[PDB]
Write a protein that binds this ligand. Sequence first.
Ligand SMILES: [Ca+2]
Ligand SMILES: [Cl-]
Lengths: 164, 164
Amino acid sequence: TKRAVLAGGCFWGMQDLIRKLPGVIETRVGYTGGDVPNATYRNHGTHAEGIEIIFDPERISYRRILELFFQIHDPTTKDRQGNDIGTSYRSAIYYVDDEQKRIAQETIADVEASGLWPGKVVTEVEPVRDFWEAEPEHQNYLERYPNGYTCHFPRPNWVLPRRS
Amino acid sequence: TKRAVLAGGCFWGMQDLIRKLPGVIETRVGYTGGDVPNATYRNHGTHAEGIEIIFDPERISYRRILELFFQIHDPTTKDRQGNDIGTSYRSAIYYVDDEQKRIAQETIADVEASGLWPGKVVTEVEPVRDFWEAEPEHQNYLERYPNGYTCHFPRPNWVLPRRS
Ligand SMILES: [Ca+2]
Ligand SMILES: [Cl-]
C-alpha cells in the first residue's frame, strides 16, 4: 500500500470525489503543509486543508491519482478554490518520496503543455510533513450529508493524453 | 493489502477497537452472512452486523487480527453479545480464502485448548459472501460519539501464547 497527500480546496469535496477512485483504500482529511502543531478547523495557521489517501498501487497509480486531482480542482488560482478564499484552500502536492516528487513534476509539466487549464499551474510541490487529522465531524462529511457543500467536480476538459 | 470480515456483536464497538490495531488501514461496518439483498439497519434478515477490515499484511497478520477479535468479544454466547440479543449479534469469521479458513480453524482450536474463555467457542466459520455496507450514520460512530454505546473491551485474560 502507498500514501498520497494532496490539497486543493475545501476538504469535504476532495474526499467526496477521491474516495470514489477504484484502488483507493482509505481517505482522511486534515491540516498539513503549515506551521502549527495540534491543528484544528478554526486554528491551523498556515496549514492547507488536505487529504491523505492510502491506495493499492496494483490497482491504481500515483499518476492516475494526480490526474483526478487536476481534474477536480482548479490548480491555477492561488490561495483560493471556487468560493473558498485563503491559504487554507491552496493547491499542493505533498510527496512522500522521490518517485512521487518526479511524477508530480512531470504531471504538472504535462498539465501546462496541454494548454487545457486556465493559466499557469500554481500547485505547490513539497515533501510531506506532519498531517494533523481533522475532527471526526469532518471525516466522510459528504457521505453523511450527500447534498452538502462542494465546489469540486470533474471537468471532462481537464484530462491529459494517456500515453501509457 | 488484505481483507478480513468478522462479526462479534454491535458493530460500533467492533469498529472502535479494531480500527486501533496497528496495520489496519480501513474498516467499514455492514451486514453480512445472511439472506436479504440491500440490507439495512432495520431490515437485514439473517445477516450479522459485521465489519470489513482492510489491512497491510506486512504490518499485521490475519492471525493477530483474530487474536484481537477473540479478546474483545465473548465468542461463547450464541446469538448474543452482552446486552445485545439476536442473530444480528452473533460471532462469525467470514474467510476470504483457504489460508484464512485454516488460520480461523487453528485459532479457534487454540482458543479452546487454552481453557481461558467461558465455554465452547460458538463462532461460525463461513466463506465470505455479499457485504452490505451500513448507512453512513453507522460508520465511525464511536469516533463522532466517543462516549457512545459499546459492550466490547479487551479482556487481558483472553489472550493466547504467542508461539511465533
Ligand atoms: Ca474510513
Ligand atoms: Cl464518519
